[PDB]
């Protein structure tokens, strides 16, 4: 994973696990407690993938409830980093323009690698998004997308729709409903 958003997780897992917990998982990969990662590091997914075991174990939350409380809380952190993806008025235009962000990222920033997040209108108050990636994360995926729905106050329903791997992609469908329309009436 890039440098740029694991240095989001650290923050995001702090503000939700807080220090004690944080620095005693890091340290348990060899980093020190305090580290503090830079935009255009490469860190080791399977050293992610150890801290957050590490986090699991701490909290006593396995790593699935872990990776979902991390993406909903992340988008905070986003909107506080990089808050010009938030200028926006409706979550339904935010979510339609995911794929073309991470796109652009994938452009503009050396060696990143995020998922495919195509989306479509399917409904007057629906929309469908596929997370379609080499990596597996159903649950930061879920979470990400109920964290967006909390910062632009408006109530949706993640209906889970398909998930399985294929080809050496992980694919999430999800059918995503809005409590208010999304059409123009």
């Known amino acids: 994973m890039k440098g740029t958003i694991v240095g989001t997780?650290?923050?995001?897992?702090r503000d939700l696990y807080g220090n004690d917990v944080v620095d005693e998982s890091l340290?348990?990969?060899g980093w020190?407690?305090?580290?503090?990662?830079?935009p255009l590091e490469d860190i080791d997914d399977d050293e992610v993938r150890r801290i957050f075991a590490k986090v699991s174990e701490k909290t006593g939350?396995?790593?699935?409830?872990?990776?979902?409380?991390?993406g909903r809380q992340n988008i905070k952190t986003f909107s506080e980093w990089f808050p010009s993806y938030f200028a926006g008025?409706?979550?339904?235009?935010?979510?339609?323009?995911?794929?073309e962000v991470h796109l652009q990222l994938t452009k503009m920033i050396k060696g990143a690698t995020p998922p495919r997040l195509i989306?479509?209108?399917?409904?007057?108050?629906?929309i469908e998004m596929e997370y379609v990636s080499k990596r597996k994360m159903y649950d930061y995926f879920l979470g990400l997308i109920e964290g967006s729905s909390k910062f632009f106050k408006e109530e949706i329903s993640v209906e889970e729709v398909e998930r399985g791997e294929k080809d050496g992609f992980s694919r999430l469908k999800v059918r995503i409903k809005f409590k208010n329309p999304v059409f123009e009436y």
């Open 89 to 99: 008025r409706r979550l339904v235009n935010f979510l339609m323009m995911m794929d």
């Open 32 to 38: 020190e407690p305090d580290r503090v990662i830079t």
């Open 119 to 126: 989306a479509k209108p399917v409904a007057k108050d629906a």
């Open 61 to 70: 939350k396995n790593v699935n409830e872990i990776w979902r409380e991390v």
């Open 9 to 13: 997780w650290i923050k995001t897992l």
């Open 27 to 29: 340290k348990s990969v």
